[PDB]
Design a protein around this ligand. Structure first.
Ligand SMILES: CCCCCCCCCCCCCCCC(=O)O
Length: 289
């Protein structure tokens, strides 16, 4: 293992990207403003806030964020980049070794299901397979601390409500989460020498919804920004983002749960970071510089 951890390495999608796609896009997407400095929200994302809670003075020197907006598990224009390629990018730059002193974080899958693909069960199968494959690869290359996050109920996104896909998006979310729990249970039993951490985003997001006003949200179905999506634009998270009309963004968004048709606002990312930190503290995870 590794008693105190010295950094966080995150693999994920637009829920975790801290500006990687924005840089490659020459700052043209996500347009900022109204997005915040290339994050897919109007403030820093959860994993940045988590890193700063442990390393308040120089959090970015303790966070290696390989998440790109539009990333998912391969199942090809649907996906900007794959989990496998994010992991292999980390490995390439680290001499094919996963540091035993890093907290590896995997939050992926939402981009696959929100593309509303036509093959339901094959998509579920291949997302689960791709996550298991990347976990096994990290373990094989020396990882000793792995945090896996499941999905919120994607049927709650404004996208699902507007497009009439609530049932399908909730089904993907629930089936994905059930399979992912089985995967994590398998790895826990097989690799007791690795620290396995799990965050039940599904239950936490439902709790936020059920108590939305108490968490600070006055609107859970609308969007701070405004997008106009066609039929061939409904096909992907990145198309929805590109279709934001910046001049029509609301000026006062402190009460919205959703910044755009799928992405949560800054306050939701803050809540997520706070709950993740409490989970890690309960588990006894310790960081140090
Ligand atoms: C522990 C805090 C509970 C609240 C969780 C906050 C996260 C909100 C989730 C909204 C749906 C996100 C879908 C984004 C699209 C994608 O990642 O491809």
């Amino acid at each position: 293992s590794m008693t105190p951890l010295n950094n966080i390495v995150v693999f994920g999608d637009s829920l975790s990207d801290n500006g990687n796609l924005y840089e490659y896009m020459k700052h043209q997407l996500p347009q900022s403003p109204p997005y915040f400095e290339g994050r897919f929200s109007n403030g820093p994302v959860w994993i940045e806030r988590l890193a700063a809670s442990y390393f308040p003075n120089d959090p970015n020197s303790h966070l290696l964020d390989y998440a790109f907006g539009g990333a998912g598990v391969s199942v090809d224009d649907e996906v900007f980049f794959t989990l496998r390629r994010e992991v292999n990018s980390y490995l390439l730059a680290h001499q094919d070794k996963a540091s035993p002193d890093s907290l590896f974080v995997i939050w992926i899958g939402a981009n696959n299901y929100l593309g509303m693909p036509v093959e339901v069960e094959e998509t579920l199968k291949n997302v689960n397979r791709g996550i298991a494959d990347s976990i096994q690869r990290l373990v094989d290359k020396g990882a000793k601390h792995i945090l896996v996050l499941n999905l919120p109920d994607l049927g709650r996104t404004p996208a699902a409500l507007e497009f009439g896909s609530v049932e399908e998006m909730t089904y993907f979310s629930a089936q994905h989460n059930n399979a992912l729990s089985n995967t994590v249970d398998y790895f826990k039993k097989t690799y007791p020498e690795v620290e396995w951490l799990f965050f039940d985003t599904g239950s936490h997001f439902d709790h936020v919804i059920e108590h939305a006003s108490e968490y600070g949200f006055t609107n859970i179905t609308g969007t701070c920004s405004f997008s106009i999506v066609d039929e061939i634009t409904k096909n992907s998270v990145l198309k929805m983002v590109a279709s934001v009309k910046p001049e029509l963004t609301e000026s006062a968004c402190d009460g919205y749960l959703f910044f755009d048709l799928v992405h949560p606002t800054a306050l939701a990312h803050k809540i997520m970071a706070e709950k993740a930190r409490l989970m890690l503290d309960e588990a006894g995870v310790e960081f140090a510089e």
